[PDB]
Amino acid sequence: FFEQMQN
Amino acid sequence: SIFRCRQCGQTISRRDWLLPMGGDHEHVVFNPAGMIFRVWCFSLAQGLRLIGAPSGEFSWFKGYDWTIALCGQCGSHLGWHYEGGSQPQTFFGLIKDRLAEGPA
Ligand SMILES: [Zn+2]
Numbered sequence: 001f002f003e004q005m006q007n
Numbered sequence: 008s009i010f011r012c013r014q015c016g017q018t019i020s021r022r023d024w025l026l027p028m029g030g031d032h033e034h035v036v037f038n039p040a041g042m043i044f045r046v047w048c049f050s051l052a053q054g055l056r057l058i059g060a061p062s063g064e065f066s067w068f069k070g071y072d073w074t075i076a077l078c079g080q081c082g083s084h085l086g087w088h089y090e091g092g093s094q095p096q097t098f099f100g101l102i103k104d105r106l107a108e109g110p111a
Binding site: 003004005006007 | 036038039040042065066067073075084087100
């Protein structure tokens with residue numbers, strides 16, 4: 001999940 | 008003229024608060040996981056929850072550090088808060104298709 005939210 | 012979270016209706020921003028960063032409010036960008044986002048820049052937003060501490064890594068906007076912005080109500084990823092920069096110091100990059108536009 002965190003990977004998909006990184007800018 | 009206002010933008011709400013598409014998932015739950017939380018009030019997030021306003022059309023009046025669109026910010027043309029580098030000439031345009033709209034930036035099409037991808038992250039290291041290859042996700043593409045249509046990001047709309049806003050001066051101001053509300054109803055968000057900023058998670059973690061700011062990071063300059065992979066920043067799409069020169070001189071700015073980002074924190075992930077979730078909907079403060081439903082926890083949906085809505086974009087990023089940008090800070091640590093100049094003119095302006097801070098702004099929000101919100102994912103257009105995660106917002107619903109409608110009457111005030
Ligand atoms: Zn929401």
